[PDB]
Amino acid sequence: EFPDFP
Amino acid sequence: CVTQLLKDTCFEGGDITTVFTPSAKYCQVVCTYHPRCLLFTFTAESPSEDPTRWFTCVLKDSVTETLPRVNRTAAISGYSFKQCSHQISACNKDIYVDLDMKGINYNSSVAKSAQECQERCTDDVHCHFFTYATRQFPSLEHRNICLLKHTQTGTPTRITKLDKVVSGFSLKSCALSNLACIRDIFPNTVFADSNIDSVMAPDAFVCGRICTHHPGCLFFTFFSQEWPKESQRNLCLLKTSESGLPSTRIKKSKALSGFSLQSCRHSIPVFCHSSFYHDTDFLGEELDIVAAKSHEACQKLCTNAVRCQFFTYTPAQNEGKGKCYLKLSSNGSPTKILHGRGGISGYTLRLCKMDNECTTKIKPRIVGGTASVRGEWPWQVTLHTTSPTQRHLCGGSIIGNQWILTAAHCFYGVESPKILRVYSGILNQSEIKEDTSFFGVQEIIIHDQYKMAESGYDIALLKLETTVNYTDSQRPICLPSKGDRNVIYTDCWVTGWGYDKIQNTLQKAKIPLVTNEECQKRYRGHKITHKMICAGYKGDSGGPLSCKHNEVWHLVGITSWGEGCERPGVYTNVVEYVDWILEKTQ
Ligand SMILES: *[C@@H]1O[C@H](CO)[C@@H](O)[C@H](O)[C@H]1NC(C)=O
Ligand SMILES: *[C@H]1O[C@H](CO)[C@@H](O)[C@H](O)[C@H]1NC(C)=O
Ligand SMILES: *[C@H]1O[C@H](CO)[C@@H](O)[C@H](O)[C@H]1NC(C)=O
């Protein structure tokens, strides 16, 4: 996984 | 059938499942493609609703085929297209602004535009959907990043509003991907990676067709009926892997293994399993049982009953009349497949309407050996010019309701489309008389960059001013798929009349393809580009090069020059012009 947008 | 939606209407109950869609119109597509959904209720962005309950698409089933409507604000509903005669696609070109669609985030590259992000998603083995942060996005770290995503269903696990971001789906189901399909079916081998799902399939064709429309399935294994363990016959395991390939292939026997084909989706049947399965009983929930004279009449009753997904027919093998058991299940598939009880089983054809129409089977009717008949080449058309008097000018192929694909060099000093006349289902030119009906060309789309036939960029479209009532005499051919670039066609056929000197009856002749390298040698003065393909060792300008592959016909080439009825003819390489054709048509 990548962290997604703030 | 009720294609339109319903301003502020909710259906009460039915709740089969709940998913998140970006819009009602797409929720309708999900409903249509789900094996049990008849109707739905979507929740729009509104004052009236908690932000959590937005983008909610609730798929429903009713036995009566409708539900009770309730006036409720922000709600859009809600019938599936199963009831419709219209064709249907899952292709959704919509880009969704200020919208973040959530799932497993797996590549996080950086991109030029929303467009190039979509292109990446479409070209990737794992991508269901994407989010792209525009230039205008706050965090400078994040602006321009294109992160790809997947889920179990293909739909997002959630949808939230987030300013300066754009979301959208893979366009594999618009025939736009350049991902190569692998058509090879590995026998006596199994695969051992993740097991994301399983159904009961009667053969490995069916198995691999189900892998194709299942969004999380990249490859599969089928344990045939002849397998050891009782608990595992007709078991279609649907697989995937982080890499996307099966890590390893075990010799392991009585099992076939293959790959998804989401990429070559149109041009192959997917939803349409017209075959019958003899001394085979499909287990599931019974819906009706009816008198029936043939197992064909059984299918037609299944197909005609919207809830029915599959059937078994019991021959009186007495008074002649069989029992037709109309059935359904949770997915679209039997819960158990049993052999040795004398039934004929198959599926609803209510599903073929989702398949691309140029994939429908061919009849059987004649081999002639040399000349054509009735409905042999339903896509081939004759192109008439009214100047100086009425004559055949070109061959063309039907590729759309409203479209012909043909050579640009055909239209040399044609001044107006109004000089043209397209005729379909024609054999003897003799058969054309003033009374004979024809299609009038609204428009000629020549490729920009076309100058000379031997320069190669030689391709034309005719938009017909009235659409084609599809018949046994008038059906389209399919465009080659971009995934199928590595395909080795071995059953290729040129059709036409003579075009100089013209033959009366439609000439048919099977011809071998010839490699570009190989052709280039025979052709001294002129360059043969990758945007051309060759063949040889009896048709017109603009005439089709038709190849049969897996009982489906493809338009591989269009006639362009050639010498002489021995040197190979040059052709326009249709595959290399697919973005283009799709561009100019939608
Ligand atoms: C064209 O029509 C039939 C085939 O449908 C053929 O037998 C006939 O000979 C042709 N007519 C001519 C050459 O006058
Ligand atoms: C819901 O309300 C009323 C009565 O049920 C009726 O006029 C109609 O069916 C619905 N829609 C609107 C706009 O009033
Ligand atoms: C996405 O990122 C990979 C590495 O994670 C990179 O090599 C590539 O440029 C991107 N994807 C492609 C071409 O599929």
3-state secondary structure B420-470: EEEEECCCEHHHCCCCCCCECEEEEEECCCCCCCCCCCCCEEEEECCCCCC
Tell me the CATH number for domain B277-356: 3.50.4.10
For B357-586, CATH number out of 3.50.50.100, 2.40.10.10, 2.70.98.20, 3.40.50.1820 equals 2.40.10.10
In angstroms, the CA B212 to CA B261 distance is: 5
**B263 SS3 class:** helix
Q: Does domain B180-276 have CATH number 3.50.4.10?
A: yes
Residue type at B32 in one-letter notation: T
Q: Which residues are CB-neighbours of B580 under 8 A, at least 6 positions away?
A: B447, B459
Looking at domain B1-89, what is its CATH homologous superfamily?
Hepatocyte Growth Factor (3.50.4.10)
Q: What is the H or E stretch that residue B70 is in?
A: strand B69-71
* Nearest Cα to Cα of residue B199 among B303, B305, B284, B289: B284
Are B334 and B200 spatial neighbours (Cβ–Cβ below 8 Å)? yes
Q: Which of B490, B577, B496 is nearest to B532 (CA)?
A: B577
| Pair A5, B133: CB distance under 8 Å | yes
Of B105, B107, B138, which is closest to A4 when you measure between CB atoms?
B105
Q: Which pair of structure tokens corresponds to residue B235?
A: 């078991």
The DSSP H or E segment spanning B549 is: strand B544-549
Helix (H, G, I), strand (E, B) or coil at B535: strand
Q: Provide the shortest C-alpha distance from residue A3 to chain B (in Å).
A: 7
CA-to-CA distance for B3 and B195, rounded, in angstroms?
37
CA distances from B512 to B77, B106, B495, B576 (A): 53, 44, 13, 20
**CA-based end-to-end distance of chain A:** 15
**Closest residue, chain A, to B100 (C-alpha):** A5
* Resolution of the structure, angstroms: 3.1
CATH number for the region B90-179 comes to 3.50.4.10
Q: Do B434 and B384 form a contact (C-beta atoms < 8 A)?
A: no
First to last CA, chain B: 25
Is B183 annotated to bind ligand?
no
Ligand closest to CA B8 = 2
Exposure string for B219-240, b = 16+ CB within 10 A, e = fewer: bbbbbbeebeeeeebbbbbbbb
- In short, whether B374's Cβ falls inside 6 Å of ligand 1 is no
Dist. CA B435–CA B245, nearest whole Å: 59
Is B524 annotated as a binding-site member? yes
Q: Is B522 annotated as a binding residue?
A: yes
Find where tokens 């949808």 sit.
Answer: B159
Residue closest by Cα to atom 12 of ligand 1? B430
Residues A4, B102: C-beta atoms closer than 8 Å: yes
**Nearest-by-CA chain A residue for B166:** A5
Q: Cβ of B96: how many Cβ atoms within 10 Å?
A: 20
Residues with Cβ within 8 Å of residue B572, at least 6 apart in sequence: B407, B456, B458, B459, B531, B532, B533, B557, B558, B560
> How near does any CA of chain A get to the CA of B112, in Å?
18
Whether residue B129 contacts residue B96, with contact meaning beta carbons closer than 8 Å, is answered with: no
Spatial distance between the Cα atoms of B481 and B179, rounded to a whole number of angstroms: 10
B138 neighbourhood in chain A, CB within 8 Å: 6
Domains B180-276 and B357-586 in one fold: no
Cβ of residue B428 lying under 6 Å from some atom of ligand 1: yes
Cβ of B109 less than 6 Å from ligand 3: yes
Which residue's alpha carbon is at the smallest distance from atom 6 of ligand 3?
B109
Q: Could you give the residue numbers annotated as active site of B?
A: 409, 458, 541
Sequence spans of domains, chain B: 1-89, 90-179, 180-276, 277-356, 357-586
- One-letter-per-residue 3-state SS of B274-300: CCCEEEEEEECEEEEEEEECCHHHHHH
Q: Which ligand is nearest to the CA of B6?
A: 2
CA B97 to chain centre: 28
Q: Please check whether residue B311 is in contact with residue B322, taking contact to mean a CB–CB distance below 8 angstroms.
A: no
C-alpha distance from B264 to closest chain A C-alpha (Å): 29
Task: Name which of B359, B363, B350 is nearest B300 in CA terms.
Answer: B350
Query: Which of B504, B507, B508 for mutating ligand 1's site (highest number of atoms within 8 Å of CB)?
Result: B504
- Which residues lie below 8 Å from residue B328, measured CB to CB, with a gap of 6+? B36, B284, B285, B287, B307, B308, B309, B310
